C-alpha cells in the first residue's frame, strides 16, 4: 500500500484525491458484528476446529473465498434491483429524464451482469484452491507417520539398543523419507503451478471485469451528455425531447466496442 | 510390515478405477492419480529391500543353522 | 423409435465397463466389445437419416403451414 512517513494511520492523498477531496466516511458503520451475520463467523472458527493441522489454514482459505462469493452474490443480485427500482421511478418524471434514467438502469443492469459473470470465474478461483488444498491435506498423514515413527524409534533406542523392533524402524524411517521425499518436492510444484495459474486467471478475470465496467462507465458518461441543465423559470414550456436515437446510438457504440473485446487489445498499458 | 502398504496400494488403485468408473470429472481422481505415484515409489523401495533382507537374512540364518 | 437404440448402446458401454472394471479375463467382453462396435454402426446409419428427415421433414411441413 502506500504510507506516509508517520505515526498516523491516515495516509499521503493521492494525486486523484488532490483534484477532488475526499468525502467523509459512509453513514452505514452499523454498530453490530459486521461480518457477514454470524453463521459465517462462527463457519471461520469451524474450518480450523476439526482439519488437518497443515490445511488448516487453507480450509479456512478456499472457504473463506465462499464468503466472499456470498456476500458479493448479494451484492450482484441486490444491486441489480437497484436497476429495477431506478428505471421504475423514470415514469413519474419528464420525457427527458425518463430516457436517460431507464438507459441508465440498461447501464447498470450490464454492470450487475458482468458481476455476475466475475463471481463465476471467482468460483472457479475458489475450486482450484479447493483442489491445492486437498492434495496438501492428503499430504500431511504422511508427516504424522514420519514423525510417529521417528518418535517410536527414539523412544525405544532410549529404553534398550537391543529391541527387535529398531531394526526394522530404522528402515521404516528410510521407507517413509522416500514416501515423503518424492510428494513433498511435487507438492512444491503443484502448488506453484496451481497457484500461477489460478491468480493468473483470477487477475484475468479482474482485469475482463474492470475495463467492461470503464467501459459503461465512460459511455455512461456520454449517456448524460444528453441530460439539459438548463434553469428552466416557472411558467414557461419545455422544449420536446429529441436525443432519441442519440441515446440509443451510444448503446450501439457500447454494444459494438462490448462484441468486439479480444484479450490482445488493452486501452490500459502498465509502464 | 511390509504387507499394510500392499493393502493401501490396492486400495488406492480399486478407488480410482470406482471413481473414474463413475464419473471423470470427480475432484478426488485428480489427487487420487498421485496418491497412486505416491504409493507406487513407497512400495517400490522396500519391495527391493525386502527381497534383499529375506536374501542375506535366510543366507545367513540357514549357513548358521547347518554349521549348528 | 430412434430412443431404444441409444438405450441399447449406453446399456452396452455400461456393461463392458463394469466387466472390465471387474476382471479383463471375462469372456463376455470380447463379445461385448464387437457389441459395442455391433451397435455404432447400428445407432450411426439412422442417426445420420434421424438429422436428414427431420431437416426434410421440418422444412416441408412448416413451409406448408407459412403457405397455409
Do not use: C
Request: proline share 5%.
Amino acid at each position: 500500500m502506500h504510507r506516509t512517513y508517520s505515526l498516523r494511520n491516515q495516509r499521503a492523498p493521492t494525486a486523484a484525491e488532490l483534484q477532488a477531496p475526499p468525502p467523509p466516511p459512509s453513514s452505514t458503520k452499523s454498530k453490530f458484528f459486521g461480518k457477514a451475520s454470524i453463521a459465517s463467523s462462527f463457519r471461520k472458527n469451524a474450518a480450523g476446529n476439526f482439519g488437518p493441522e497443515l490445511a488448516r489454514k487453507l480450509s479456512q482459505l478456499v472457504k473463506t473465498e465462499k464468503g466472499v462469493l456470498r456476500a458479493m452474490e448479494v451484492v450482484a443480485s441486490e444491486r441489480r434491483e437497484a436497476a429495477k427500482q431506478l428505471s421504475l421511478w423514470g415514469a413519474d418524471n419528464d420525457d427527458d429524464v425518463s430516457d436517460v434514467t431507464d438507459k441508465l438502469g440498461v447501464l447498470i443492469y450490464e454492470l450487475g451482469e458482468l458481476q455476475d459473470q466475475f463471481i463465476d470465474k471467482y468460483d472457479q478461483y475458489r475450486v482450484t484452491l479447493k483442489s491445492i488444498r486437498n492434495i496438501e491435506a492428503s499430504v500431511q498423514p504422511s508427516r504424522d507417520r514420519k514423525e510417529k515413527i521417528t518418535d517410536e524409534i527414539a523412544h525405544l533406542k532410549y529404553k534398550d539398543p537391543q529391541s527387535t523392533k529398531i531394526p526394522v524402524l530404522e528402515q521404516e524411517l528410510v521407507r517413509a523419507e522416500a514416501e515423503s521425499l518424492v510428494a513433498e518436492a511435487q507438492l512444491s510444484n503443484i502448488t506453484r503451478e496451481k497457484l500461477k495459474a489460478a491468480y493468473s486467471y483470477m487477475f484475468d478475470s479482474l482485469r475482463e471485469l474492470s475495463e467492461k465496467f470503464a467501459l459503461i462507465a465512460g459511455y455512461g458518461k456520454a449517456l448524460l451528455e444528453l441530460l439539459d441543465d438548463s434553469p428552466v423559470t416557472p411558467g414557461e414550456a419545455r422544449p420536446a425531447y429529441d436525443g432519441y436515437e442519440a441515446s440509443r446510438q451510444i448503446i450501439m457504440d457500447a454494444e459494438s466496442a462490448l462484441e468486439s473485446w479480444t484479450l490482445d487489445m488493452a486501452a490500459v498499458k502498465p509502464t
